[PDB]
Amino acid sequence: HHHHDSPVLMVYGLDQSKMNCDRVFNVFCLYGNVEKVKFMKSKPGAAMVEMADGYAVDRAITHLNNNFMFGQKLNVCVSKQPAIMPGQSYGLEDGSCSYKDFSESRNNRFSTPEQAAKNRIQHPSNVLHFFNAPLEVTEENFFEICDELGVKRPSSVKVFSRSSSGLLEWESKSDALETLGFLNHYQMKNPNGPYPYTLKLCFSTAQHA
């Protein structure tokens, strides 16, 4: 027999101080639609993540298992529990909600076949591809954001000459993955529009920025 089918992942090795539901979404949304994230008081460093389907679970396991974040190995496994019930929510170490439902997030990337086709699913690398940044974005903007978030500045930034896109490179895969968790969907001032830009990040297969 094979593993019992399930749209729910168990992730172990999350940093108890630094991770929260939104930051988990920030990593896992690269691999499929994220429906729910649940931290459990009884299970330190672990979260259940419900994806849209079993295929998204397969993608997340294939790509994120055995990667490292904040000096810890991430272990991404199929959950024997195939649905998440909220239970009694609590505050995480940062005070944020232990449970979040992302089913209605505008930041899910695989909600339609046309949208899904514009995503490339790749392994974690030391290079992030950014999209939906302001037109006049510079390396300096990224440095300040990283400084303010308390994450490592990228060692190299390329802004490709609506919005800007480009590449952000760190010295290590762990640095980029940590920053992905913090920086994905960061809100940037729009000097010429009604809403700010939601910065969108993906992994790149480009060797360098």
Swiss-Prot record:
Annotated organism of origin: Homo sapiens
Name assigned to this protein: Heterogeneous nuclear ribonucleoprotein L
UniProt PTM comment: Several isoelectric forms of the L protein are probably the results of post-translational modifications. Phosphorylation at Ser-165 by CaMK4 enhances interaction with a CaMK4-responsive RNA element (CaRRE1), and prevents inclusion of the stress axis-regulated exon (STREX) of the KCNMA1 potassium channel transcripts upon membrane depolarization.
Record note on quaternary structure: Identified in a IGF2BP1-dependent mRNP granule complex containing untranslated mRNAs. Interacts with HNRNPLL. Interacts with APEX1; the interaction is DNA-dependent. Component of a complex with SETD2. Interacts with ELAVL1. Part of a transcription inhibitory ribonucleoprotein complex composed at least of the circular RNA circZNF827, ZNF827 and HNRNPK. Interacts with CHD8 in an RNA-dependent manner.
Function of the protein: Splicing factor binding to exonic or intronic sites and acting as either an activator or repressor of exon inclusion. Exhibits a binding preference for CA-rich elements. Component of the heterogeneous nuclear ribonucleoprotein (hnRNP) complexes and associated with most nascent transcripts. Associates, together with APEX1, to the negative calcium responsive element (nCaRE) B2 of the APEX2 promoter.
Gene field: HNRNPL
Subcellular location(s) per record: Nucleus, Nucleoplasm; Cytoplasm
Free-text note on domains in this protein's UniProt record: RRM domain 2 has moderate RNA-binding affinity. RRM domains 3 and 4 may facilitate RNA looping when binding to two appropriately separated binding sites within the same target pre-mRNA.
Cross-link for Glycyl lysine isopeptide (Lys-Gly) (interchain with G-Cter in SUMO2), residue positions: 189
Superkingdom, natural source: Eukaryota
Modified residue annotations for Phosphoserine: 6, 165
Note: Excess hnRNP L activates NMD of its own mRNA by promoting the inclusion of a 'poison exon' containing a premature stop codon and leading to nonsense-mediated decay. It also cross-regulates inclusion of an analogous 'poison exon' in the hnRNP L-like pre-mRNA.
Domain RRM: residue ranges: 7-103, 120-204
